[PDB]
Amino acid sequence: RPTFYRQELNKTIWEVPERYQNLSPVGSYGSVCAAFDTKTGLRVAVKKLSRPFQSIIHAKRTYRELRLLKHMKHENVIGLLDVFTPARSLEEFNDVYLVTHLMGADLNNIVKCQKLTDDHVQFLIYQILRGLKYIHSADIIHRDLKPSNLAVNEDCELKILDRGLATRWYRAPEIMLNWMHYNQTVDIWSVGCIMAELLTGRTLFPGTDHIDQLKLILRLVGTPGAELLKKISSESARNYIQSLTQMPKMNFANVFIGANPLAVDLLEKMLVLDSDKRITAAQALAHAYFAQYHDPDDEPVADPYDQSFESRDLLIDEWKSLTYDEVISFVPPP
Numbered sequence: 103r104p105t106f107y108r109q110e111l112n113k114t115i116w117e118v119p120e121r122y123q124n125l126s127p128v129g130s131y132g133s134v135c136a137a138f139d140t141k142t143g144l145r146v147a148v149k150k151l152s153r154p155f156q157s158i159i160h161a162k163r164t165y166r167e168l169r170l171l172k173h174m175k176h177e178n179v180i181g182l183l184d185v186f187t188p189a190r191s192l193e194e195f196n197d198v199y200l201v202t203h204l205m206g207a208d209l210n211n212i213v214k215c216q217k218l219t220d221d222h223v224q225f226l227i228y229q230i231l232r233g234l235k236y237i238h239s240a241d242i243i244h245r246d247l248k249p250s251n252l253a254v255n256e257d258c259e260l261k262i263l264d265r266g267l268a269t270r271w272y273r274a275p276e277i278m279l280n281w282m283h284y285n286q287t288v289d290i291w292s293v294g295c296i297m298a299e300l301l302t303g304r305t306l307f308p309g310t311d312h313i314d315q316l317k318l319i320l321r322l323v324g325t326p327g328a329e330l331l332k333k334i335s336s337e338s339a340r341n342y343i344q345s346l347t348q349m350p351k352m353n354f355a356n357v358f359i360g361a362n363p364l365a366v367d368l369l370e371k372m373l374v375l376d377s378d379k380r381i382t383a384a385q386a387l388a389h390a391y392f393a394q395y396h397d398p399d400d401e402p403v404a405d406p407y408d409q410s411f412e413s414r415d416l417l418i419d420e421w422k423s424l425t426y427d428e429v430i431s432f433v434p435p436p
């Protein structure tokens with residue numbers, strides 16, 4: 103094991119291996135320091151989880167987060183450099199620290215302070231969909247893909263994160279109707295919204311609440327056809343939908359007038375009401391808009407990810423001991 107030191111920072115008492123040095127507050131389910139890794143000469147992020155075992159909910163979340171990050175090994179997805187605890191045994195086990203690459207800015211920190219070239223839009227979105235193929239191949243649905251959940255460096259390299267450094271704006275329509283049985287393509291909807299915005303400099307659907315959101319969506323893509331309406335069991339949803347004057351499907355070419363026409367085509371295949379018909383991550387990767395970036399031999403899939411634990415109601419000490427096992431068995435990257 104290594105030797106630890108304690109330090110006060112912003113009311114929280116930090117205790118880390120000496121290998122981590124120059125700790126400084128980056129921000130704020132835990133708080134995050136930037137730190138110098140003396141082992142590699144690289145700057146890193148060190149997140150102290152707050153109250154990781156406060157309850158059954160926190161504890162399972164803590165385990166969920168550690169299981170996810172141990173699994174994610176892909177250039178466009180946040181992954182884990184280190185995890186530790188000052189605890190000497192399970193009996194003392196009370197804090198968990200997570201270490202990842204220091205990510206300086208999110209996609210939003212870009213869009214707002216620039217106007218993106220088409221080639222930027224191609225590189226950014228290709229990276230998203232490359233990691234999303236990987237995420238999806240693990241049978242994970244991201245569910246909250248939005249600009250604050252995407253890390254982008256000065257080199258315009260991107261990774262998908264679990265959590266940032268308004269959600270509804272990027273949420274698939276089926277989610278705001280509480281449909282339940284989402285497939286992965288709820289994340290494609292979100293990618294379409296992000297893309298639109300990168301091209302346009304404007305939020306595609308700045309809904310004020312969930313009802314407003316559905317309104318703004320139908321104006322673009324138009325009222326659902328017969329083949330779709332017949333799948334909405336909710337009487338109230340049906341009535342709200344049909345009460346909203348029969349809206350024509352706008353021409354995407356006019357909404358995105360001036361965009362690379364191939365970006366318009368891709369957008370049309372992403373932002374489709376019927377999630378059955380939404381282009382998948384792997385499909386999208388082969389769309390000619392990414393011809394410059396696509397390489398089918400460098401778009402890998404994930405090892406299958408065991409998420410049966412999600413189906414379990416366990417005791418705090420059980421989630422705690424599972425988490426403890428995951429820390430102990432962590433094997434760092436190369």
Ligand SMILES: CCCCCCCCO[C@@H]1O[C@H](CO)[C@@H](O)[C@H](O)[C@H]1O
Pocket residue numbers: 275276281282283284285316319320326330333343375376377378
């Ligand atoms: C915005 C007004 C209506 C939105 C229609 C959304 C159509 C969503 O698509 C539907 O999603 C479900 C998966 O969640 C599937 O069970 C259905 O097969 C699929 O067609």
